[PDB]
Structures are given as structure tokens and as C-alpha cells.
């Protein structure tokens, strides 16, 4: 309606129309809001809009309209600033300064419109980045001068200086050139004496806590970069550590300042600085004790209640204590007068550690680790912290987590192992008595018995074998008793699991006591019949877990046993596993495989193997005999499930046995590949008969599982195979016959990506031994897979990913295959590589750039022969230009390193003259012309057309640098990053590329 009047710039901008369009966005809703949003976005993105900014800053009353006005100015200043006339630049500088001063004097505006003041300041700082100090040398003197006259201005000057420091030191790395960063850094550094005088003056003399906070906000940012002498050789540590810790508004920021002070770069041999570092800590802990809370305060309760900024404050206290004590605790450990300070600060951390807040706990746990590690290796230190460590033991155990939470569990275990070593007797007691409180019912809960079980399990290996023996027995006895005590099937299940959990975590004890181990295993087998939720999984997870650790004690004959226990498992395998789910059985068989691999007698391993595979081989034989006599029986969904389960049982055993699986693969190999064909037919039949929807049906998905599990089995064996001669002569040819044609000749939606995956492993292990076999793999999968994935970046994600893995390993192992490709297909190979660059998906991109890199090395390695010369004539400037496209398009920033490396290699070839022929066609350039010169011209031209707002001088300077720096990678990468800045703006300094 009337809202789109603002998009017509041929008339004067109607401010009242804008203010209501803006109002409609920030206070409106539905269609009203959405239409206003698209008008502001078209207004803001109008290149002329900045001209109508000074109109809005003066005439509009809406702060949101004024915010958007400065956003339009912000976009001009960073990007198109240097293109303006010299007068416009001074004109804009003036009314940004004049706006800020006038808003700060008006106390009504200064208090209420804070968002608009801060945005104006940031818009000012964007001007300084363009104009300071070269064209504004009096900015700092004048800012210090204005700060005398008005307190509100003084405060806002601290916000400006805060943002200036942020933009120059904290956020320069990405956003501006190296040269311009150093310039602005050197410029602030040079005048910081004058800025610090004003800072310390306000902190000493000021009463206004709003002004004081903003000053301390600025100081936090200074402490990232300023020299240490400004903190240590002035009074400012005394002020932060005493005065500003007492008032609660200044406390938050002061604590964050002292945290960063603790990290300052300091001489480590000066006695006075050591006392000063000690002092500010002593002062800070003194104020905490008198002004915030004593050492004994229950910080867990305070944090939970969440009053005001207590949660932020306690977070910041942890950060301050940990940071300082990680660096400086040495200073407190020697002097007996500092002993109370040292232990008080650690006692605060102990209290902070009890806070129920995961990410805070992680922070404190990192420190405990640092400490207990130091106490374990550092001599005469642990006796100091004996009362701290004892409390810590209880804190870790009560907050211990399941092994599934991998990173947090690992940290907790590490610390508790160290604490167990430092005092094994104390750790045992805390654990045993915690267990007695589970029995007496005072701290009994499913969670509480679980955490204790995880905790008790974590410290395995740390005690002596004797202590461990006595300890385990006591724990297991108590837990068995706890089980008998408790009533109901839920309770007894929880405890049984924990009983079985702890047992699994103490393998040393299981290895030394066979009679017990045997009992535990037979008990797991009893639990493999229980139907209660989670018990069967627990029994199987625990079984394979014990087997992985104690596998030698299953494969040999123990004293007072007729045979190795592996045999006794294999016999009752049917009865043991009858009640399990299919995938639980596969774990059991995989576990049996682990054991069997230990047996080094070949005849016995083979006998155990075929004994183990008795059930699946008899089911297999009866299904082969049936289904070969009549392929009708495969439509029976029940038969497809059984076949898939047999193959999955094989995969499971092959996974744990690797090279030892070859005999069992032999029993089924030829019939299995014949089944792959019968199933392949079945699938192609259903797709013709029923349409593409067929592939979504249970029966076709079932059949496809067979194919994928057959491919998975072959991949798994070949990946781990020791006898590569047998893999080539026996396995490969049948495999390539069975799988390649089926893949090629199926419609895209019926092609299994697992085929590509399988072939990758084949080329990896034996690619070098089958040159004619690899050529066959390309012919069958290359063109038809490329066509599936070269229309968009989305479709067939597995195929796409596995596709670039296959080409990578071919290009690595059997590059000869790409030579034998006809020129047209070799052209598609190159097209496919560059296509991989343009992906966001990391798995494709990384391989894309890697293939290109390896392909270049492969061509280099061919030397001065016609194929390598014809590759350079055809594809050099494709790789250079396509690499440059992804470097500069702002949407492949994840791949910058491999891109930079690929680009450097491409340039280095011409710098060293490793391309023998000319890269230009005849009569394009003068005759006796080096490739260096024509490379500089092609790129100068290419970049001129891609980035026309660049000057000729800019482009020539960038390329001089880039080519001279094509031996040093990190400098090259630096010069690329400088180019990525200068293309985002107009009038970038060409001299910036001489930085190195």
C-alpha cells in the first residue's frame, strides 16, 4: 500500500512514512510486520540510501529509524568510503560527532536511548578505522579534553575507546589487512599513555558508578594487549582488588579484569611483582569473605536460587580462582603466612564444585586436574592439600557420570585416579561408607547406586592387586546383599546391572580368579533369558566387554577344567541365545570371534570357527538348496530376514577375526555372490513391475539389506586381510562380476552406494595388484554415478560422498587407470574434481581438493612426456581459476587451507618452470615468453573481470607478492587473506601486499 512509497527515491523521503514502516516491523505482527521487513531490507540495500541518513538523524524521532540510518552509514564506511569525495568524508565525520555530543548532553536522551548512542559510537569507530590517526591526529587529545566538561560525555568516551580497542586488537584478524591492523595497533599503543592517565584518573577520583563501570569495561579490553608495567607500576591493582570489589555494580567487571590480569605477561624472577601478584589475590579473597559470602557458605544453594546476578558472579569467581591458581599457586605454597589464603581459595573452589551446573563443573574439574596432576608428579606438595583432596574425592564420586558421556567421564576418571593414588586408604573408605548408606536406605536411589557404581569402576588399576582384591570382594558382597534386601523386579534389576557393571570394570581381578569369572559368565547367560527391559542388552554388553579384556583365559585350558571354556560356550550357543533379539545374538557371536582369534594353532582356530558357525551355516545351506532350486522363495519376507541375519552373523564374526575369517568366507563365498545376483534380479523385477515406489517397500528394502550386508562382509574381510594374493585370485574377479554390472544397469534409486564403498576398500588394499580390475571399476561406476550427483549438491548424499572417496584412492594407488580413460571421460574427471570444490559438505570438499592436489603431483611425476604437457595446456588454468573462484566467493571458507595449498602448488610449477610447454596457444603472446609472465597476465585479466572495483595497481601488487611467496605457505595464506579483505571494499592500499 502506502508503505512502498519509501522505495520511490525520486521524491523526498517521507519521515513519518518511514517511522510507521519501522513501527510496523518492531511492534507489528503477521503480514503487516513481514511486508514492512521486506521494504526496510530493500530500503537499506538501496546504494543511494546513505544520502538520506543525515535527514533521518535530525528529523526523525524514532530511535529504531535512526538505528537503521546508522546501519546504512556503517555499510558505506566499511565498503564504499574511499570512493567518496574528500568533503563528504569530513561532512559525515562531523554530524556523527555532533549527534553523539548533543545526545550525551541531553540527560533525557542519554539515559533512555542507550541502544542508539552505542550504535553511533560503533559508527564513529568505523570512521576511525578509515581515517585515524593519519587524517585525525588530534582525536585522542580532543576526546581527553571533552571528558573534563561533561560526565555523560566522559562515560560515552569510555564506550568509544572500548569499541576502538575491540575493533583493533580483538577483531582485526579477519576484518582488515595485516598492514592496516599493525598501523591501527601501533597507533593506539603510541597514544595509550594519554588514554591510561584519563582511565586511572576517573577510577581514582570518580563517584559516578555508571562512569566507573564503563571505565572498567574499557579496562578489561585494554588488558588483552597493554604492557604489564601499566598495571604493576601504578596503584591500579590496589583499586581493583579492594575498592571496586566492595560495590556490587563494579564487582562483576572488576573480577573479570583481575582474571585477565592473572594472565598478563610478567617477569618470572622479580620479587616485587611476586608480592604484588600475591597482594591483589589476598585483597580480592578478603573482600569476598567480608562483602559477599564466607568460605563456609553453601554456594550450591545460592546458585540454585538464582538471585540477581549471583549465578554470573559465581561463574566469574570460579574463572578468577582457577585462572590465577593455575598460574600462580606456587607463590602461596612456600610462605607459611600465605598458607591460609591458599587453602581458603581452594575451599571456595570446593564449594563452587558442588554447584549443580554442568558447564561450571567442567571448568572447576579442569583445575582439579591441573592440581592433582601436579601433586602426583611434584614433590613435597600433596601434604598441603590433604584436606582439600579428601573433600574433592566425595565431590567427584557424588557427581560421577555414566561412561556414555565420554569427555566428562574421562576427565572425572583421570582426576579420581590421581586422587586414589595420592591416598588410596581415604578413597576406599569414602567409597565403602557411601555403599553402606545405600544399604541403610538413607541415600538410596537408582541414580545414587548407579553413580557410585560408575565411580567405584573408574579407579580400576590404581590400587595394589591385594588391596583391589579385598576391595572388590567387599563391594561385590555388599552389592549382592543389597540385591537380596531390595524388593520388586525393578529394584533388583538396577542393582544386578551395577553388580555386573563393576565386575566388568575390574578385569585384573577376573584374570586372577577363574572360578569367579566362570560364575559371572554363566550368570550373564542366565540374564540372557530375562525379558525385563535392558537386562538382555546389559548381559550382552557386559559379556563382550569382559571377553575383550580377559580373552586369553577363555582360549586356554584352566586347571580343573576338561577343556578351554570357548568350547563350552560354543556347545550351548543355541540354548544360551534362543531368547535374544537378532542383533544381540550378533554381539554374542562377535564376542566368540574375539576369543577364537587368540588361539594361534591354525587347525584349532579353524575347528572353533566352523563349530561356532554351525547354526548359521546349516540355515544357510538349507536356504541355498531351496532358493537355487526355485527363486520364488526369496519373496517370502521371513526368508529374507533369515538370510540377512545369517550374513550379519558373518559380518559380526569377521569384524572381530579379520584375516582369520577367510575359511568361513570360503564356505559361503560363491553361493553368496550367486545370491547377490538372484536378489539383484528380484529388485530390478519389482522396480519395473511396481515403479520407483518399489524401493521404499519392506520386501525390496529387505532384499537390498542382503546386498548391503554381503558388500559389508566383503569390505570387512578385505580391509583386514593379510593374504593379498588370495584376495586377488579368489575373491575379486567373482566380486567385480557380481556387483559392477548390476550397479551400472540399475536405475539411480536402486543403486547401492555401499557398492562404491566396497570398491574403495578393494582399491585401497589390492588396487596396485589389479590395474585392469580398477579400469573395470571406473567404467562401471564413474560416468553413471557422476550423473546422479552433478545436477545439485543435495541428491544422493551417500553416493556423492563414497564417489569422491573411490576416485581419491584410485588417484593415489592406481593412477594408470585415469591415463587409460579416453580424453572425453578424462575431461569429466576434471569436471568432477572442481565440482567437489563447490560443495559445502565437508566430506566431499576435502576430498575434492585432495584429489586435485594429488592429480597435480601425479602429472608432475610423469615428467616431460606428451600427456603431462597436454594436461597443462588443457587443465592448468581451469584448476587455477576454479581454485580462485572458491577462495574468493565467501561460501567455501571452511576449505581455505587446502585451497591455499592447492593454489600455491599450481603457481610453484610455473615459478620453478616444471611445466615444459608454453601455457598459451601460438600467436596469443610474443614468441620467446616465459610462463611466469603469461601467468601474471592471465591472472591480472581474470581478477580484473571478477573484481572490477579493484585498481590495476592493486591486482598487480597482490600477484607480485603471491608469486614471490609461493614457497612459504603461511605468508602466502596471509597474502590471500589480505586479498579477501580488499575485494570487500573500494580503494584498498596496494602497498599492503609488501607486509612480508
Amino acid at each position: 500500500g502506502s508503505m512502498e512509497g519509501i522505495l520511490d527515491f525520486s521524491n523526498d523521503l517521507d519521515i513519518a512514512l518511514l517511522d510507521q514502516v519501522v513501527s510496523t516491523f518492531y511492534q507489528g505482527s503477521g503480514v503487516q510486520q513481514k511486508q514492512a521487513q521486506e521494504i526496510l531490507t530493500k530500503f537499506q540495500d538501496n546504494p543511494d540510501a546513505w544520502q538520506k541518513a543525515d535527514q533521518i538523524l535530525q528529523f526523525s524521532t524514532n530511535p529504531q529509524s535512526k538505528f537503521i540510518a546508522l546501519s546504512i552509514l556503517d555499510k558505506l564506511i566499511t565498503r564504499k568510503w574511499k570512493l567518496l569525495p574528500n568533503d563528504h568524508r569530513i561532512g559525515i565525520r562531523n554530524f556523527v560527532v555532533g549527534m553523539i555530543i548533543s545526545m550525551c548532553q541531553d540527560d533525557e536522551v542519554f539515559k533512555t536511548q542507550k541502544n542508539l548512542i552505542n550504535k553511533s559510537d560503533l559508527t564513529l569507530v568505523q570512521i576511525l578505522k578509515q581515517e585515524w590517526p593519519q587524517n585525525w591526529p588530534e582525536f585522542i587529545p580532543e576526546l581527553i579534553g571533552s571528558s573534563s566538561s561533561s560526565v555523560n560525555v566522559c562515560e560515552n568516551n569510555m564506550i568509544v575507546l572500548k569499541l576502538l580497542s575491540e575493533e583493533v586488537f580483538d577483531f582485526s584478524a579477519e576484518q582488515m589487512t595485516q598492514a592496516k591492523a599493525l598501523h591501527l595497533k601501533n597507533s593506539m599503543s603510541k597514544e595509550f599513555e594519554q588514554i591510561f592517565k584519563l582511565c586511572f584518573q576517573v577510577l581514582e577520583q570518580g563517584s559516578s558508578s555508571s562512569l566507573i563501570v564503563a571505565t572498567l569495561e574499557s579496562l578489561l579490553r585494554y588488558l588483552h594487549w597493554i604492557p604489564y608495567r601499566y598495571i604493576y607500576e601504578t596503584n591500579i591493582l590496589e583499586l581493583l582488588s579492594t575498592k571496586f570489589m566492595t560495590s556490587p555494580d563494579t564487582r562483576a567487571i572488576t573480577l573479570k579484569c583481575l582474571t585477565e590480569v592473572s594472565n598478563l605477561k610478567i617477569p618470572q624472577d622479580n620479587d616485587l611483582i611476586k608480592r604484588q601478584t600475591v597482594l591483589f589475590f589476598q585483597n580480592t579473597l578478603q573482600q569476598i569473605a567480608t562483602s559477599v559470602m564466607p568460605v563456609t557458605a553453601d554456594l550450591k544453594a545460592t546458585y540454585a536460587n538464582a538471585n540477581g546476578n549471583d549465578q554470573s558472579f559465581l561463574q566469574d569467581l570460579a574463572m578468577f580462582l582457577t585462572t590465577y591458581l593455575a598460574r600462580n599457586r606456587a607463590l602461596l605454597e612456600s610462605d607459611e603466612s600465605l598458607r591460609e589464603l591458599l587453602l581458603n581459595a581452594h575451599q571456595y573452589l570446593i564449594q563452587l564444585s558442588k554447584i549443580e551446573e554442568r558447564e561450571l563443573f567442567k571448568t572447576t574439574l579442569d583445575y582439579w586436574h591441573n592440581l592433582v596432576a601436579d601433586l602426583f608428579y611434584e614433590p613435597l606438595k600433596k601434604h598441603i592439600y590433604e584436606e582439600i583432596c579428601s573433600q574433592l574425592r566425595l565431590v567427584i564420586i557424588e557427581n560421577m557420570v555414566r561412561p556414555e558421556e565420554i569427555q566428562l567421564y574421562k576427565s572425572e576418571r583421570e582426576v579420581l585416579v590421581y586422587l586414589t593414588h595420592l591416598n588410596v586408604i581415604d578413597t576406599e573408605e569414602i567409597m565403602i561408607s557411601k555403599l553402606a548408606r545405600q544399604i541403610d536406605g538413607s541415600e538410596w536411589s537408582w541414580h545414587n547406586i548407579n553413580t557410585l557404581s560408575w565411580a567405584i569402576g573408574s579407579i580400576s588399576g590404581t590400587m595394589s592387586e591385594d588391596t583391589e582384591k579385598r576391595f572388590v570382594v567387599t563391594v561385590i558382597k555388599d552389592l549382592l546383599g543389597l540385591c537380596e534386601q531390595k524388593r520388586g523386579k525393578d529394584n533388583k534389576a538396577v542393582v544386578a546391572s551395577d553388580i555386573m557393571y563393576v565386575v566388568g570394570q575390574y578385569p585384573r581381578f577376573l584374570k586372577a580368579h577363574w572360578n569367579f569369572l566362570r560364575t559371572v559368565i554363566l550368570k550373564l547367560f542366565e540374564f540372557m533369558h530375562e525379558t525385563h527391559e535392558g537386562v538382555q542388552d546389559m548381559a550382552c554388553d557386559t559379556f563382550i566387554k569382559i571377553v575383550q579384556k580377559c580373552k586369553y583365559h577363555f582360549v586356554i585350558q584352566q586347571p580343573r577344567e576338561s577343556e578351554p571354556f570357548i568350547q563350552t560356550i560354543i556347545r550351548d550357543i543355541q540354548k544360551t541365545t534362543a531368547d535374544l533379539q537378532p542383533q544381540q545374538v550378533h554381539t554374542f557371536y562377535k564376542a566368540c570371534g574375539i576369543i577364537i582369534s587368540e588361539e594361534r594353532s591354525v587347525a584349532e582356530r579353524n575347528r572353533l570357527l566352523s563349530d561356532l558357525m554351525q547354526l548359521p551355516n546349516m540355515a544357510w545351506d538349507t536356504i541355498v538348496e531351496q532358493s537355487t532350486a526355485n527363486p520364488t522363495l526369496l519373496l517370502d519376507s521371513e526368508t529374507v530376514k533369515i538370510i540377512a541375519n545369517i550374513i550379519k552373523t558373518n559380518v559380526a564374526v569377521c569384524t572381530s577375526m579379520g584375516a582369520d575369517f577367510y575359511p568361513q568366507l570360503g564356505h559361503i563365498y560363491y553361493n553368496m555372490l550367486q545370491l547377490y545376483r538372484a536378489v539383484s534380479s528380484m529388485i530390478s523385477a519389482q522396480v519395473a513391475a511396481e515403479g520407483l515406489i518399489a524401493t521404499k517397500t519392506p520386501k525390496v528394502r529387505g532384499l537390498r539389506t542382503i546386498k548391503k550386508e554381503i558388500l559389508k562382509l566383503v569390505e570387512t574381510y578385505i580391509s583386514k586381510a593379510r593374504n593379498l594374493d588370495d584376495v586377488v585370485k579368489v575373491l575379486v574377479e567373482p566380486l567385480l562380476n557380481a556387483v559392477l554390472e548390476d550397479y551400472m544397469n540399475n536405475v539411480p534409486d536402486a543403486r547401492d552406494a555401499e557398492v562404491l564403498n566396497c570398491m574403495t576398500t578393494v582399491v585401497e588394499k589390492v588396487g596396485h595388484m589389479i590395474p585392469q580390475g580398477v579400469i573395470l571399476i571406473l567404467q562401471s561406476v564413474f560416468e553413471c554415478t557422476l550423473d546422479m550427483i552433478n545436477k545439485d549438491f543435495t541428491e544422493y548424499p551417500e553416493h556423492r560422498v563414497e564417489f569422491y572417496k573411490l576416485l581419491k584412492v584410485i588417484n593415489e594407488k592406481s593412477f594408470a587407470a585415469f591415463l587409460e580413460l579416453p580424453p572425453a571421460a578424462f575431461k569429466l574427471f576434471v569436471d568432477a574434481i572442481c565440482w567437489a570444490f563447490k560443495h559445502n559438505n565437508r566430506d566431499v570438499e576435502v576430498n575434492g581438493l585432495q584429489i586435485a592436489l594429488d592429480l597435480v603431483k601425479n602429472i608432475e611425476r610423469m615428467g616431460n612426456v606428451p600427456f603431462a604437457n597436454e594436461f597443462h595446456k588443457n587443465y592448468f588454468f581451469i584448476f587455477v581459476s576454479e581454485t580462485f573462484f572458491v577462495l574468493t566467493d565467501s561460501d567455501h571458507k571452511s576449505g581455505f587451507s587446502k585451497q591455499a595449498l592447492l593454489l600455491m602448488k599450481l603457481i610453484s610449477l610455473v615459478y620453478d618452470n616444471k611445466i615444459s610447454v608454453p601455457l598459451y596457444q601460438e600467436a596469443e603472446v610474443p614468441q620467446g615468453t616465459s610462463n611466469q609472465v603469461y601467468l601474471s597476465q592471465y591472472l591480472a585479466n581474470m581478477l580484473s573481470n571478477a573484481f572490477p572495483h579493484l585498481t590495476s595497481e592493486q591486482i598487480a601488487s597482490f600477484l607480485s607478492a603471491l608469486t614471490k611467496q609461493c614457497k612459504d605457505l603461511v605468508v602466502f595464506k596471509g597474502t590471500l587473506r589480505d586479498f579477501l579483505v580488499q575485494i570487500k571494499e573500494v580503494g584498498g592500499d596496494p602497498t599492503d601486499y609488501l607486509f612480508a
Binding site: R470, I476, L480, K489, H532
Partner: peptide, 19 residues
């Protein structure tokens, strides 16, 4: 040994059933 065997016997009797 002595404590280990009387643990093994207690382990054997472990159940999830009340009766």
C-alpha cells in the same frame, strides 16, 4: 581364596525374582 570362594557361591544365587 577363602573370601573369594564364599563370594563365588553368593554370586551364583543372584536373581531378579522375589520368590
Amino acid at each position: 581364596d577363602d573370601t573369594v570362594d564364599e563370594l563365588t557361591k553368593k554370586f551364583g544365587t543372584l536373581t531378579i525374582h522375589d520368590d
